[PDB]
């Protein structure tokens, strides 16, 4: 009869991290220092008129809509340890 | 008869982190220093008129609608330990 | 009967990190120092008119919509250890 000692330390990380971002989009970021006119899909006798006069001390600084998609998995100071002080395995079979 | 000692320390992380962001969108961020005119899908004799006069000391700083999608899984100072002080496994089979 | 001692320290990292970003888009970032006119898919007798006069001290600094997609998996100070102080394996079979 032999004395068996077994110690095991496993760590499996089955990780799947994804970050998808689709956009079917029209027009989006349109910016005009003076007048801006937008006409989406006019039909038949669709009269659209804009009038504007003079253009003086104008500041126009559009900061816009930032889109951000993220997906993180983080392990900070993870530890899987096994401290076996003073191990001994004696077999004595006369 | 052999003395068996077994120690096991496992840690399985079956993780799935996702972050999806779709947008089917029209027009979105439209900015005009003077007049802005938008006409979506006019039909038949749809008269639309805008008039504006003069343009002086104008500031126009549109900060807009930021979109953010996130998905985190974090493990801070995780610990799976097994402290076995002074282990001993003796077999004595005359 | 022989005394067996076994120590195992495994660490499996089955990782899958992805970051997809599609965009079927029209027009997007359009910027005009004076007037901006956009007409999407006009049909039939779709009269669209814009008028503007004069263009003075104009600043026009469009900061726009930054899109960012990210996906991180990070392991900071990960540790899978096995400290076996003073190991001994004696076999005594007269």
Numbering used by the authors:
A (entry chain A), B (entry chain B), C (entry chain C): 271 to 364
Q: Could you share sentences copied from the article?
A:
Mice transgenic for human mutant P301S tau are widely used as models for human tauopathies. They develop neurodegeneration and abundant filamentous inclusions made of human mutant four-repeat tau. Here we report the electron cryo-microscopy (cryo-EM) structures of tau filaments from the brains of Tg2541 and PS19 mice transgenic for human P301S tau. However, the structures of tau filaments from mouse lines Tg2541 and PS19 share a substructure at the junction of R2 and R3, which comprises residues I297-V312.
The filament core from the cerebral cortex of 48-week-old mice from line PS19 extends from residues G271-P364 of tau and consists of the C-terminal four residues of R1, the whole of R2 and R3 and 28 N-terminal residues of R4. Its secondary structure comprises eight β﻿-strands that range from 3 to 23 residues in length. The four-layered ‘head’, which is made of β﻿2-β﻿5, consists of the nine C-terminal residues of R2 and the whole of R3. The ‘tail’ is two-layered, with one layer consisting of β﻿1 that is made of the rest of R2 and a small portion of R1, whereas the other layer consists of β﻿6-β﻿8 and is formed by 28 residues of R4. Similar to filaments from line Tg2541, tau filaments from the brains of PS19 mice contain putative non-proteinaceous cofactors and/or post-translational modifications. A large external density is found next to K290 and the adjacent Q288. In the PS19 fold, these lysine residues are located on different sides of the main chain, with K298 making a salt bridge with D295 that turns the preceding N-terminal residues in a different direction. K281, K317 and K321 co-ordinate the second additional density in the Tg2541 fold; it makes a right angle turn between strands β﻿1 and bβ﻿, whereas in the PS19 fold, K281 is in the middle of the long β﻿1 strand, where it is buried alongside D283, K343, D345 and D348, in the interface with R4 strands β﻿6 and β﻿7. The secondary structure of segment R4 of the PS19 fold is consistent with the β﻿-hairpin that we propose to account for either island of the Tg2541 fold.
